[PDB]
Design an enzyme around this catalytic site. Structure first.
Site, PDB file in Angstrom:
ATOM      1  N   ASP D   6      26.181   0.355 -18.839  1.00 45.76           N
ATOM      2  CA  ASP D   6      24.813  -0.113 -18.952  1.00 45.76           C
ATOM      3  C   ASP D   6      24.075   0.627 -19.889  1.00 45.76           C
ATOM      4  OD1 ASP D   6      22.822  -1.652 -16.843  1.00 45.76           O
ATOM      5  OD2 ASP D   6      21.748   0.173 -17.348  1.00 45.76           O
ATOM      6  N   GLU D   8      20.517   1.321 -21.829  1.00 44.81           N
ATOM      7  CA  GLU D   8      18.991   1.449 -21.873  1.00 44.81           C
ATOM      8  C   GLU D   8      18.319   1.182 -23.415  1.00 44.81           C
ATOM      9  OE1 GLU D   8      17.182   0.467 -19.012  1.00 44.81           O
ATOM     10  OE2 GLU D   8      19.110   0.632 -17.780  1.00 44.81           O
ATOM     11  N   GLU D  55       7.244  -1.809 -23.070  1.00 41.22           N
ATOM     12  CA  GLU D  55       8.216  -2.423 -21.853  1.00 41.22           C
ATOM     13  C   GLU D  55       9.127  -1.380 -21.305  1.00 41.22           C
ATOM     14  OE1 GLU D  55      11.408  -4.816 -22.234  1.00 41.22           O
ATOM     15  OE2 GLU D  55      10.445  -6.579 -21.439  1.00 41.22           O
ATOM     16  N   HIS D  60      11.692   2.502 -16.757  1.00 35.57           N
ATOM     17  CA  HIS D  60      12.171   3.737 -16.079  1.00 35.57           C
ATOM     18  C   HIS D  60      11.786   5.235 -16.716  1.00 35.57           C
ATOM     19  CE1 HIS D  60      15.545   4.310 -19.154  1.00 35.57           C
ATOM     20  NE2 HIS D  60      15.667   3.025 -18.943  1.00 35.57           N
ATOM     21  N   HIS D 156      17.895   7.626 -12.495  1.00 34.94           N
ATOM     22  CA  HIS D 156      16.828   6.882 -13.225  1.00 34.94           C
ATOM     23  C   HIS D 156      17.238   6.502 -14.469  1.00 34.94           C
ATOM     24  CE1 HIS D 156      14.705   7.548  -9.600  1.00 34.94           C
ATOM     25  NE2 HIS D 156      13.467   7.172 -10.112  1.00 34.94           N
ATOM     26  N   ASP D 161      21.572   1.528 -12.930  1.00 30.52           N
ATOM     27  CA  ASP D 161      22.037   0.160 -13.021  1.00 30.52           C
ATOM     28  C   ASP D 161      23.554   0.044 -13.036  1.00 30.52           C
ATOM     29  OD1 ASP D 161      19.461  -0.792 -13.081  1.00 30.52           O
ATOM     30  OD2 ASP D 161      19.169  -0.439 -15.061  1.00 30.52           O
TER      31      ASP D 161
END
Lengths: 290, 366, 347, 219, 145, 366
Positions: D6, D8, D55, D60, D156, D161
């Site tokens: 995952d 970010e 955004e 997070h 976090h 995720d």
DNA sequence: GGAGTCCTTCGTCCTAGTACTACTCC
DNA sequence: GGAGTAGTACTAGGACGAAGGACTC
């Protein structure tokens, strides 16, 4: 517009002296015009069974029929229908349909122009898109047997000599398979089911008033026998206390009556014709008051 | 905290005490067991606030005291399922109970002992001991006549009435009544107390009707029963019990005895052609003979004729057959004596050969 | 709307009564008007007629049980009966409506036994030997809102709560999960099974005049948090709220819960009472003291407002006892309204 | 052997190349072997090379100043490559992540080809979309669906995720397989319209034509 | 019909003139007057004896009386079914033949065409149309649902 | 119509014929029996409209032909209820059936025999008899794998397949499958028929395994089974049974052998802590060891280590534990041999002594 | 254009059937 | 201790009533 007939009045078809108030028969039957001028007299739905009974005694129950009305698939219904078939609970779908204004003629194209949240949720939600794309393909389609009567028809023989029926599982509540416009163009006269709870109210309230008879030996009350210039009535009207007063329940209409202070019967006949978008937004209301 | 015990010592207690505990109670720690090690003793608890069952077992191998509470159903199934003769080693570590036995290894979720509703201490008022076998008789002979879910909350149970050296039971739902009494041979105080349906079901359940003495201590609103190292405690409900002396038939003039199995097989058969819902039958009795007739809407009939011991006038009376079938089944005797008065009045029913028991069920109006 | 119109007109307007009411709103001699039975929302037309019919053949209804026996459950369902109590139709007999709500089920169960007893002809052993539309509206708000004197949560009244229901929730803080406290004016609790665990199921009612909500996919603690959730006729709980894509509500997990009682602690929340000028003296040392004395917990300061003719002075009781929070309900029991102010200590 | 990732990022470009002007800020990946969490997670933070997207910040909480001392993609290029090489890559919207991944790989200038040439590229969203067609198959959607806590998790950002997607992935690739099974001319009569019928026909068409002004039978 | 017991079959009846129109009007009324279940009102085969004049009928195809009897392979039942139309609807009974790619249609068709030549009775094919274009099918499926 | 039979000639027939009665006979005469008296033979019918059950009792006492239809459950209970050696007298009195026994009298409603539905005659195609024993083992060995409610309605039944000297039965869910094959001792032509599950339950119940041989005939659309004088006939659901030869593992190269009881006990215990929906247990095989483990989201865990004869590579595999326990319960045997492929293939399981039955369950991915 | 008549759909409660587990009998 | 019978628990289907979108002049 049958109150323009003094004959209707004379026969107790209507309740008004048309010569007193200049009411016109030629709106209702014009001899110089050749197409049937459907007289369409209506009555209280509460007492349908009593009337079906009279008109069966008169003509034969099989020579008598109710007239069907039809359910299509409009904006709120099509959203609801597709939403359920796509497996949403009612909550999901209703949060969309409550954004569609109530409006009589609503279509998906009209809904998109009236409500900006529609475009938005369409592009942001897979399920909504699939649903509306399909609702667009089916917009306005039929779904079912029309609900009861819109009106009751009188044939000289079996109604089935002219139209097909629909009846319930007990073969009761027979209705013509052609709708109101269609059924009459196929040649049979209809009689509509008046929509009011006001006569049911009057009825019950009169029973209760006339019991105040024996309580102090008062004659029964005949609403037709009241004086037509009553000051109590006009006093209360000038005081604007007309919510719960038949036809005049609107807040706007109460606003108007307050400023207008209508003080004679003629003015009371006028109120529904005055209380409209045209008359108010052509200065005529202000002229009239002034 | 740490203990070791033998599956075999633990298993029947486990079964008897878990029995009534709801798979899913409304307060879910009620589906866990409180486990307490103190002294040379494991204390087990299942309760429902109304009753409590406690088992104690002496700890033979090295141990360490403490408290916790473990999920009852799954733990019992685990224990039941274990191999023959299994000696399991258990120890509390943090918030898990680890179970070792041979090469089986467990770590089970745990709820704190502290959260468990500690039932109320009360003062004993009247106490007695008796043979297990008398107790089992008393209960078996009677328990099936209690109501199930009666609104007169004091009928969901059995009143025990103690007078002199006799202890007496009665159980009833207001439509049938059964009385059974046995001599206890001890001078007691005078006290009556109604203990709940579910309490009595479970007490009967654990009655290993062997040698074991059973000692009981009663309070004003609670009951205590020791058999061996099983301890039963229940709260009581208060209610003003109905007078069995008004229910006992006034003057039964006519007496009728009959052989039990023949009587019972005949009732079971006439029952087939009675109304399924109300179980209604009509009895015709005459000189030395009984004729029962019934009917259903299907227009079927049942008729049974049998020879009975009867001296007295002919008589006509109807009952709910479920009510009499239930007594005939519970009564495991040779011959019966029925004491009736008339068609409209209560009847006493009893083993012709014992006097410990007496039953009255009312007749019907159809 | 209609009533408000009546009232303004000079029209009043008796509360409902089982004994006096007909189908329609009726004129007793003096009482211009008393509730018609059909006026009640939930009750069907068949049940209204059933009630009246039973009352016609028999006398006017004596008691709860008398009612149940004459009219079976078939005619008057449980749900029907609930609304009847809430309307205040029974108030005459069952002075305490709370008492009446509780007595319904048993009487209902009882009655089924009465039906059975009839049918079988069967003999038994012996036996068994002030205002109109302002109380009803008040009840609705207990179930759908009540928030008199603000709320036990004075230190953080609506500041935390929000009580607009779905309509307010839609426009919420964006975040991982909204911070929200819901209290429930109605709760029923059921836990399912399948012989190997199962997460579910919570029943709350959610305000304002919204509907009711589940929870919702959790409970954490495992069974200690499940019991906090319980409490019928009572609940406050705190949860995370997001807009759930799936409908039937939004999603709720219980991160924390506090009870009404705990909020009523009014931590650092507490108690002040308003009383009339005329108080005996013994009330100071007797009834007032005794209400507080048995219900002690959670160091809540007692503040006292003695409405004087001359001025308002604050006399701090602080005799000893710190009141438990259950006292509101008990105090409201008779003749005295209290107000739930910010506790003095916290500020 | 199953490898869960995952990623970010510093937001996306909404137009053109979703990777143009952007770089990786955080890598959170868990290793999943035989549907069990080993705990040998790859969790690193990287050099932003740019501003963190507003955004992404709200999602997070990540500030640029935090990812300054942390190493770049070049310092863990080989490290991360060997960690996923020769395994299953389960991704959300593979076009997005793979696009970023290969983008960073080309920035290293080691001639690195697309990951799909040496690895099995699998999007889990596509699987969920096949299982639940036309339904929201987001992580939180599936989370709620398979009864999962995403609120009391300390991790976090990416690793949150990733863990959740692993539980969703297990749920989808449960429970149980299915059993491979499924699996002359002659005569015949022409009925010619009688003279009566023909007359009715003619009269009926006359009516159509006289009233409507057309006849196709006859057009 | 009495031939198939409880089993309902699908039927097309056309009124060819005004005698037919009135017969069709009375037939429909009689179905509703009889009462019905979730399926809607139904006609008995034998009501077509009286309600007869001016009507032209289609056999029903695979879904009809005769098609279903043919698929069972009850030759006696098939013969009884057609016999009715030969008696009460001479020159006015046409056997429906259908190619829409549905189960058993070709096997039925082959056997029906043999029966039709063996009896000398007249046949008509239709497409039993419910929609404008083939891509509308999915939406109509959902409409029905 | 009159006949007289002895209770004990009627009782086993009656019990057996009353088995198919159950599922909500809307058509009320399904709750009744068909009686035909002719010769010294009363014939019984018990039916669910798709299958039929026939019984004879010999008539030693006086008899007279005729037919009617009596209520089956009620009549069965009356007969079962009567004492052994009780004399039952039948005699039709117009529109009632009278049942007497000495001095007791009962009257039954009468619906005409002529209203009882008749299934079509058909003829046999392939024919065989076999020892009851073989039929017993065949059904018992496989019944657990029946589908419960499947949309693939053809799986709600069991394929009987004949060829040469081999019958092999199979029943499945679409998830797991049990197979059994037995010798019948006669060369048999190939046929395939699926009998509906309720059918196979009833057939199972009529087998006492005893001495009368069972003779079965199979027609185009039906099956008929005679053991002595009792005859069961059912319809078949028609065809397309998928090819079971395709699902079988293709030479499982690794073998795992272990004590059936031990193994079964450990899995029953482990099952308690697995998933609600998926019944998930995780299995590790390693050099001569088997480790069973069970998980749930609340971290509750059962774990077993066991000594297992096994040659091959380490691998892990999960499955629905209920289905594997079902097979271990049907495996009433000393040793099992488990034959694997990998963590993601179905596995075939047999008795380590007979290849006659084979059991194959699919893997779960847990 | 407003209001009422129209049914259907959604939610809640009750009834019936089916399976599992315990209790009693062999 | 195991098998058969009874009781309890869970799930499905139908009925009843209150709510909502709609089509009538």
């Amino acid at each position: 517009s049958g109150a323009g007939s003094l004959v209707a009045y004379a026969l107790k078809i209507t309740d008004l002296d048309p010569l007193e108030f200049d009411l016109l028969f030629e709106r209702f039957l014009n001899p110089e015009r050749v197409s049937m001028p459907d007289f369409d007299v209506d009555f209280c739905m509460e007492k349908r069974d009593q009337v079906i009974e009279h008109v069966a005694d008169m003509y034969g129950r099989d020579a008598v029929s109710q007239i069907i009305t039809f359910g299509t698939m409009a904006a709120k219904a099509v959203i609801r229908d597709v939403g359920r078939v796509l497996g949403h609970p009612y909550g999901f779908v209703d949060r969309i349909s409550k954004l569609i204004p109530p409006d009589p003629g609503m279509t998906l194209a009209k809904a998109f122009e009236a409500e900006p949240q529609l475009p938005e949720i369409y592009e942001a939600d897979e399920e909504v898109k699939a649903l509306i794309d399909m609702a667009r393909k089916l917009e306005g389609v039929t779904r079912n047997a029309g609900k009861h009567a819109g009106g009751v028809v009188i044939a000289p023989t079996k109604i089935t000599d002219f139209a097909p029926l629909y009846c319930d599982e007990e073969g009761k509540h027979p209705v013509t398979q052609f709708d109101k416009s269609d059924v009459e163009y196929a040649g049979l006269v209809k009689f509509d089911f008046l929509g009011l709870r006001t006569l049911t109210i009057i009825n019950w309230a009169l029973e209760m008033i006339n019991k105040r008879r024996a309580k102090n030996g008062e004659p029964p009350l005949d609403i037709a026998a009241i004086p037509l210039d009553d000051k109590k009535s006009f006093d209360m009207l000038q005081r604007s206390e007309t919510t719960a007063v038949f036809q005049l329940e609107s807040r706007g209409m109460k606003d108007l009556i307050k400023r207008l202070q209508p003080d004679c019967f003629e003015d009371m006949i006028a109120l529904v014709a005055l209380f409209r978008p045209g008359p108010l937004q052509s200065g005529m209301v202000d002229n009239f008051i002034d | 905290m740490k203990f070791t015990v033998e599956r075999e010592h633990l298993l029947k207690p486990l079964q008897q005490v878990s029995g009534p505990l709801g798979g899913r109670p409304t307060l879910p720690i009620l589906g866990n067991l409180l486990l307490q090690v103190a002294d040379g003793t494991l204390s087990l608890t299942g309760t429902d606030l109304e009753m409590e069952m406690v088992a104690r077992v002496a700890l033979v191998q090295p141990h360490e005291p403490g408290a916790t509470t473990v999920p009852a159903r799954k733990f019992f199934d685990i224990c039941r399922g274990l191999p023959e003769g299994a000696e399991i080693a258990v120890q509390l570590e943090g918030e898990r109970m680890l179970v070792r036995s041979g090469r089986s290894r467990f770590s089970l979720s745990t709820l704190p002992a502290a959260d468990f509703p500690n039932l109320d201490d009360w003062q004993s008022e009247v106490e007695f001991t008796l043979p297990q076998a008398t107790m089992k008789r008393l209960i078996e002979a009677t328990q099936f006549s209690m109501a199930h879910q009666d609104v007169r909350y004091y009928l969901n149970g059995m009143l025990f009435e103690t007078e002199g050296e006799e202890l007496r039971t009665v159980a009833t739902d207001g439509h049938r009544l059964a009385v059974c009494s046995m001599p206890i041979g001890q001078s007691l105080p005078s006290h009556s107390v109604i203990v709940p349906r579910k309490g009595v079901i479970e007490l009967m359940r654990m009655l290993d009707g062997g040698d074991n003495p059973l000692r009981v201590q009663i309070g004003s609103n609670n009951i205590r029963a020791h058999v061996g190292d099983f301890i039963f405690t229940s709260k009581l409900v208060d209610g003003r019990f109905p007078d069995y002396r008004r229910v006992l038939p006034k003057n039964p003039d006519k007496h009728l005895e009959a052989g039990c199995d023949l009587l019972k097989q005949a009732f079971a058969r006439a029952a087939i052609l009675s109304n399924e819902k109300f179980r209604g039958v009509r009895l015709y009795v005459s000189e030395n003979q009984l004729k029962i007739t019934a009917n259903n809407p299907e227009q079927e009939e049942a008729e049974e004729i049998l020879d009975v011991t009867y001296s007295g006038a002919e008589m006509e009376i109807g009952f709910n057959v479920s009510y009499v079938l239930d007594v005939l089944n519970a009564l495991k005797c040779e011959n019966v004596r029925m004491m009736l008065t008339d068609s409209v009045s209560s009847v006493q029913i009893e083993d012709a050969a014992s006097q410990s028991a007496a039953y009255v069920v009312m007749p019907m109006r159809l | 709307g209609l009533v408000d119109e009546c009232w303004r007109m000079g029209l009043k307007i008796l509360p409902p009564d089982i004994n006096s009411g007909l189908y329609h709103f009726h004129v007793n001699d003096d009482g211009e008007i008393v509730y018609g039975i059909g006026a009640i929302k939930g009750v069907g037309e068949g049940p209204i007629e059933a009630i009246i019919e039973a009352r016609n053949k028999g006398g006017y209804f004596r008691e709860l049980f008398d009612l149940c026996a004459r009219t079976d459950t078939k005619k008057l369902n449980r749900r029907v009966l609930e609304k009847l109590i809430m309307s205040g139709a029974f108030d005459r007999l069952g002075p305490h409506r709370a008492a009446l709500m509780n007595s319904l089920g048993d009487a209902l169960k009882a009655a089924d036994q009465h039906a059975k007893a009839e049918a079988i002809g069967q003999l038994d052993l012996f036996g068994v030997l002030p205002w109109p539309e302002q109380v009803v509206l008040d009840g609705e708000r207990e179930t759908l809102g009540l928030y008199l004197t603000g709320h036990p949560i004075n230190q953080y009244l609506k500041e935390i709560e929000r009580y607009v229901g779905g309509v307010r929730l839609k426009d919420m803080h964006p975040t991982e999960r909204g911070k929200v406290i819901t209290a429930a004016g109605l709760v029923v609790a059921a836990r399912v099974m399948v012989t190997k665990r199962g997460n579910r199921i919570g029943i709350c009612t959610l305000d304002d005049r919204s509907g009711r909500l589940e929870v919702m996919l959790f409970t954490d603690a495992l069974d200690k948090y499940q019991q906090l959730l319980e409490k019928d006729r009572i609940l406050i709980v705190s949860g995370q709220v997001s807009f759930d894509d799936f409908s039937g509500g939004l999603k709720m997990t219980a991160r924390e819960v506090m009870d009404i009682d705990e909020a009523r602690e009014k931590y650092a929340r507490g108690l002040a009472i308003s009383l009339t000028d005329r108080q005996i003296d013994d009330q100071l040392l007797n009834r007032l003291r005794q209400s507080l004395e048995p219900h002690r917990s959670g160091t809540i300061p007692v503040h006292l407002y003695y409405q004087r003719a001359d001025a308002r002075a604050r006399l701090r009781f602080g005799a000893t006892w710190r009141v438990s929070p259950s006292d509101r309900l008990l105090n409201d029991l008779r003749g005295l309204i209290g107000s739930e102010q910010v506790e003095l200590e916290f500020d | 052997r199953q490898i869960v990732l995952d990623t970010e990022t510093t937001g996306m470009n909404q137009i053109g190349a979703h990777y143009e002007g952007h770089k990786i800020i955080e890598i959170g990946a868990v290793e999943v072997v035989n549907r069990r969490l080993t705990g040998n997670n790859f969790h690193v933070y990287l050099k932003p090379d740019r501003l963190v997207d507003p955004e992404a910040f709200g999602v997070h909480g990540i500030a640029d100043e935090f990812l300054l001392d942390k190493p770049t993609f070049a310092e863990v290029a080989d490290e991360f490559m060997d960690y996923i090489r020769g395994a299953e890559l389960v991704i959300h919207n593979a076009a997005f992540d793979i696009g970023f991944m290969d983008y960073e790989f080309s920035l290293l200038k080691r001639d690195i080809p697309k990951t799909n040439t040496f690895c099995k590229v699998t999007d889990s969203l596509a699987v969920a979309r096949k299982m639940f067609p036309g339904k929201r198959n987001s992580l939180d959607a599936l989370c709620a669906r398979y009864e999962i806590d995403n609120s009391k998790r300390t991790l976090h950002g990416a690793l949150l995720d990733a863990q959740i997607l692993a539980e969703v992935y297990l749920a989808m690739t449960g429970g149980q397989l299915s059993l491979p099974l499924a699996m002359q001319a002659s005569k015949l009569r022409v009925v010619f319209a009688t003279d009566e019928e023909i007359a009715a026909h003619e009269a009926r068409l006359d009516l159509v034509q006289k009233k409507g002004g057309s006849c196709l039978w006859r057009a | 019909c009495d031939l198939l017991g409880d089993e309902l079959t699908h039927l097309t009846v056309l009124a060819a003139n005004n005698t037919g129109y009135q017969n069709l009007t009375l037939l429909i009324s009689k179905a509703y007057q009889r009462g019905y279940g979730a399926a809607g009102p139904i006609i008995d085969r034998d009501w077509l004896i009286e309600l007869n004049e001016g009507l032209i009928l289609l056999s029903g195809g695979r879904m009809g009386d005769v098609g279903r009897s043919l698929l069972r392979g009850n030759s006696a039942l098939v013969d009884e079914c057609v016999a009715f139309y030969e008696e009460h609807f001479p020159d006015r009974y046409f056997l429906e033949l259908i190619r829409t790619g549905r189960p058993d249609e070709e096997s039925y068709l082959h056997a029906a065409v043999e029966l039709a030549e063996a009896r000398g009775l007249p046949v008509v094919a239709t497409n039993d149309v419910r929609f404008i274009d083939s891509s509308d099918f999915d939406a109509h499926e959902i409409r029905v649902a």
